[PDB]
Ligand binder design. Structure first.
Ligand SMILES: *[C@@H]1O[C@H](CO)[C@@H](O[C@@H]2O[C@H](CO)[C@@H](O[C@@H]3O[C@H](CO[C@@H]4O[C@H](CO)[C@@H](O)[C@H](O)[C@@H]4O)[C@@H](O)[C@H](O)[C@@H]3O)[C@H](O)[C@H]2NC(C)=O)[C@H](O)[C@H]1NC(C)=O
Ligand SMILES: *[C@@H]1O[C@H](CO)[C@@H](O[C@@H]2O[C@H](CO)[C@@H](O[C@@H]3O[C@H](CO)[C@@H](O)[C@H](O)[C@@H]3O)[C@H](O)[C@H]2NC(C)=O)[C@H](O)[C@H]1NC(C)=O
Ligand SMILES: *[C@@H]1O[C@H](CO)[C@@H](O)[C@H](O)[C@H]1NC(C)=O
Ligand SMILES: *[C@@H]1O[C@H](CO)[C@@H](O)[C@H](O)[C@H]1NC(C)=O
Lengths: 431, 427
C-alpha cells in the first residue's frame, strides 16, 4: 500500500499547454531528475495543467534493487584432526645421534615409521628430546629422542568453499505507470537507458553498493546454501582464522591432500617420555557457516542465495541510492476523466522547517479510481496535491513550514467536495 | 620397592685395605663421581674388601627432585560481555555532520547518551554511517549516523590470576645409608655441599630445571588451586589469547574496571539502520584453567600446587639429571660379621654390547637384615655383587658382554649357596 515516497512537480520549463476551447493538453519536453522510490514505493512526477484542477502523475515503483556478487578469489576448507605416532630411542641408538633430534626437519619421516608406507596426506615430523638415563630406560645419560610422525585427517565427509566478491552488479527493477495509466516493468543497470512511451529513462547517478564490502566474505556448502562471514577474505593461511588450512578443491579437503596449504605450527605436542598427545585448536568452519547462514541483514541490505543458478545477492531494504533521469520527448498528456470522491487521513509530518529539504507530509488516500487529491490550508499559502487510486495508498510530498510547532487545518477533496484534515507535527531547525 | 639403579664399585685408586690381626679393615680416601639415583631409587657405591666375602655398600636414595616456581610478572583476567546503546540521527542533525561520524574516536561519548552519565567501567564509542533518504526516515539523502556507546561487564563474579615463572628453585632430597647402616636425610641446592660421617656429598652437575620453561605460564583461581597453560606469558594484551583483557586485581576484573587493559577491536558490531548487535568472541580463561588444572605432566615432570605453602612445584618422575661427588676423608670401614642367604629371582638384562656402558642385570632380592649377594656365574670372567636387605628390593648392576644375544647361566652364592639362577637377554 505504499504510493509516492518521493514526489516532485515537473518544471514549468519542460511543460507547454494549450486549450482547444475547454479541452486542454500539455506537452512534456526535456529532462526531469527524481530520486528513485524507496523499495516497494514510488518516485512520482506531477504534471500541472493550466487550471489548478489539471493534474496528472507519472509513477515509478521500485520493485527491487538487487546486487549480484561477482565472485573473485576462492578456496575450500573443512574440519581436521591430527593423528600422531611416536617412538622413543635412547641417545646413540638409531637416528638419536649427536644432533639429529634438535635439527629434525618437518618433512623428513623417521626410520621409526618406515612401516607406515607412502603418504599423500598433509603431515609433519618432529623429534622431542626427552630424559635419558636408567630412570627413563636408557644406558646413556644423554637425552633420548621421541620421534613423532603426524598426519591431518578430514573430520567430516564434506567441505566448504570460501570466497569474496570482486564486484556487486546492480539491477534496479522498476514498474512504471504512465500518465495514461498503462503499466510496464523494466530493469536498469548503472549505465543503462530504456526507451519508454514518453521518451526514455536512465540512472543518472547510481551509488547502490555494499558499503564495507571488503570486510565481507562468503561460504558455500555445496547442495546446502550460503553463509556470510563478517571478515575480509584472507588470501594467505593465518593461524586462528578461517582458511588457516585450505585446499584448491572439495575433494582435496576430504582426502586432506598434501597440496593443501596451512599456516605454521597448527598442531601442539605434549611429549611425555613414551606418552605423547597432539592437539589442534582450529577454527571450526561449520560453526562459522551456521553463524552467518543466509538470509542475513547487514546495514540496509538482506543477503540471500540467488533463486536458481546459484550465487549470493543483496537486496536494499529502504532508500535506493540512485537518481532517475526522465527524458520526455515532446510527449502529450491530456486531463480527461471524471473525478470520484476520496477519503483521506493524516499519517505524519516529518523533517525540518525553514530548510531546503522541507518537511514530508504523508496521507492515507482511499478511492475507487485514478485522480488527484487537492488540499489547501485556510489562507491558501499551503497546497497538497497527491495521487488518488482505486484502493488505498500512502502518499507523501514536501511542504514548506516556517515554524517548529505545526498544527494546520487543511480542506481536501478529489471531486471538489471538501472535508477537513489536520496536519500536525514538530519539525527541527538545521545548522 | 626399588634399590640400586646405579651401582658403581669403589675404585682401587681411592681404596687401601689390609689384614693386621683377627680381621680386615678398609680405608676410603678421595672423590668418587656417581649419577643420582632415579626418583625413589638408590645410587650405590660398593666397597670391595680383600676377600670375596667382604663387601660393603654406600646407599643414597633420591627421595625427591623438586623445582619450585619463583613467580615473576602477574595479571588478573576473567569473563566479560558487551552491552551497547545506540541512537541514529539523520545527516545535518545533532553531531551527525560531515565528517564527524567516520572520524569518531573511541573515548568520546556521544551527546545521545547523556542519560548514562558517570562511569568507571571499560567502555568505547563508535559511529557508523547508515542509509540516508526518506526510505531510512531522513530528509537528506546523505548517510545517517548510528552512534554507539558500549561497556564491558563481568559475566562471572570470580577472577583468575595469570602468572609467569622467572626461575625454578631446585631442591634434591637424598636419604643416605652409610656402610655401618646409619640412616641420614640431606637436602642439596645446585651449588650445595653437605658434610657426612665419612666426608661430604656435593652436586657436581645439576641440570634438573625445566626445558622449554619459556613456553609455560600458570593460572591461580583464588581458593581453587592452579593450572598450567601451554604457551609463553605475555605482557602485551593480544586478541585471541589469554589476557586479551587484563587487570591488576580480583575486584577490578569483577567491576570490569576502566583501569583493566584490553587488546584492540575485541568487540564486533552489526549496524542495521536502527538495530544494532554487538558481540565478543573472547577466549574463556576459565575453560583454559579447567583444561590445565594441576596436577599435570609435561616431559618428565609433574607440575603441582605446593604442599606446605602457596605456589606451584614440578617433581622429576624418572631420571635425575645430576651428578653426585662423594668425598671420603680417609674413612675406615670394617666388615664384621656373618651374613645369611636370600631369595633372588632374575628380572632383566638391558644395554648394548662392545660399548662403554654395557648391559645392566637386575635381580629381585628378599633377605634378612643387610647382606651381600654373590654369584659363581661365569667364574673366571663375570661376578655379581648386590645389597641384600630385610624386605623386598630390586637390585641392578653393570655387565659387559661382547655378543648380541646373551644366554648366560648363574649359581648365585651369597650364602655362599645354596641356590641357582639364570640370565637371558639381547641387544
Ligand atoms: C510516515 O508515513 C509514511 C507512509 O506510511 C511511512 O513510510 C512508509 O514506511 C513504511 C515502514 O518503514 C514502509 O513500509 C515498508 O514497506 C516496504 C515496501 O514493500 C512493499 O510493500 C508491500 C505492501 O503492500 C509489501 O507487502 C511488499 O513486501 C512490497 O515489497 C517493505 O519492504 C518493508 O518491510 C516495510 O513494510 C513504506 O514503504 C513507506 N511508505 C512510503 C509511501 O514511503 C513513514 O515511515 C512514516 N514516518 C514516520 C512514522 O515517522
Ligand atoms: C628391569 O627391571 C627393573 C626392576 O627393578 C626395572 O627398573 C625399575 O623401573 C621402574 C620404572 O619403570 C621403577 O618402578 C617405579 O618406582 C618409582 C619410584 O618408586 C615410581 O615412581 C614409578 O611409578 C614405578 O613404580 C623402578 O624404580 C625401577 N627399579 C630400579 C631398581 O631402578 C626396569 O625398568 C626393568 N626393565 C625392563 C623390564 O625392561
Ligand atoms: C624437505 O625439504 C627440503 C628443504 O626445502 C628439501 O630440500 C627436501 O627435498 C625435502 N626432503 C624430503 C621431501 O624428503
Ligand atoms: C581522547 O582522545 C583524544 C585524542 O587525543 C584526547 O584529546 C582526549 O584527551 C582523550 N581522552 C582521554 C585521555 O580521556
Amino acid at each position: 500500500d505504499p504510493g509516492c515516497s518521493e514526489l516532485i512537480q515537473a518544471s514549468s520549463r519542460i511543460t507547454t499547454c494549450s486549450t482547444e476551447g475547454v479541452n486542454t493538453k500539455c506537452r512534456l519536453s526535456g529532462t526531469a531528475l527524481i530520486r528513485a522510490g524507496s523499495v516497494g514505493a514510488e518516485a512520482c512526477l506531477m504534471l500541472k495543467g493550466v487550471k489548478e484542477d489539471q493534474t496528472k502523475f507519472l509513477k515509478i515503483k521500485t520493485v527491487s534493487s538487487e546486487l549480484s556478487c561477482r565472485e573473485g578469489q576462492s578456496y575450500w576448507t573443512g574440519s581436521f584432526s591430527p593423528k600422531c605416532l611416536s617412538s622413543r630411542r635412547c641417545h646413540l641408538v638409531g637416528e638419536c645421534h649427536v644432533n639429529r633430534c634438535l635439527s629434525w626437519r618437518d618433512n623428513e619421516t623417521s626410520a621409526e615409521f618406515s612401516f607406515v608406507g607412502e603418504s599423500t596426506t598433509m603431515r609433519e615430523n618432529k623429534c622431542f628430546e626427552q630424559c635419558g638415563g636408567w630412570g627413563c630406560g636408557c644406558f646413556n645419560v644423554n637425552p633420548s629422542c621421541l620421534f613423532v610422525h603426524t598426519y591431518l585427517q578430514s573430520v567430516r565427509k564434506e567441505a566448504l568453499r570460501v570466497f569474496n566478491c570482486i564486484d556487486w552488479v546492480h539491477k534496479l527493477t522498476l514498474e512504471i505507470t504512465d500518465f495514461d495509466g498503462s503499466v510496464s516493468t523494466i530493469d536498469l543497470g548503472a549505465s543503462s537507458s530504456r526507451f519508454t512511451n514518453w521518451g526514455s529513462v536512465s540512472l543518472s547517478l547510481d551509488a547502490e553498493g555494499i558499503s564495507g564490502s571488503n570486510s565481507f566474505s562468503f561460504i558455500e556448502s555445496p547442495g546446502k546454501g550460503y553463509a556470510i562471514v563478517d571478515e575480509p577474505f584472507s588470501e594467505i593461511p593465518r593461524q586462528g582464522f578461517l582458511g588457516e588450512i585450505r585446499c584448491n578443491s572439495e575433494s582435496s579437503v576430504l582426502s586432506a591432500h598434501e597440496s593443501c596449504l596451512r599456516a605454521p605450527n597448527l598442531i601442539s605436542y605434549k611429549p611425555m617420555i613414551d606418552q605423547l598427545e597432539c592437539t589442534t585448536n582450529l577454527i571450526d568452519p561449520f560453526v562459522v557457516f551456521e553463524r552467518g547462514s543466509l538470509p542475513q541483514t547487514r546495514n540496509d541490505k538482506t543477503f540471500a542465495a540467488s533463486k536458481g543458478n546459484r550465487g549470493v545477492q543483496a537486496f536494499s531494504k529502504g532508500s535506493v541510492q540512485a537518481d532517475l533521469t526522465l527524458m520526455f520527448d515532446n510527449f502529450e498528456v491530456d486531463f480527461v476523466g471524471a473525478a470520484v470522491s476520496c477519503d483521506a487521513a493524516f499519517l505524519n509530518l516529518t523533517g525540518c522547517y525553514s530548510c531546503n529539504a522541507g518537511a514530508r507530509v504523508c496521507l492515507s488516500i482511499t478511492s475507487t479510481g485514478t485522480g488527484s487529491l487537492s488540499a489547501h490550508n485556510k489562507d491558501g499559502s499551503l497546497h497538497i496535491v497527491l495521487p488518488s487510486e482505486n484502493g488505498t495508498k500512502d502518499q507523501c510530498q514536501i511542504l514548506h513550514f516556517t515554524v517548529p510547532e505545526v498544527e494546520e487545518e487543511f480542506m481536501y477533496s478529489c471531486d471538489g467536495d471538501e472535508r477537513p484534515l489536520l496536519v500536525k507535527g514538530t519539525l527541527i531547525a538545521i545548522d
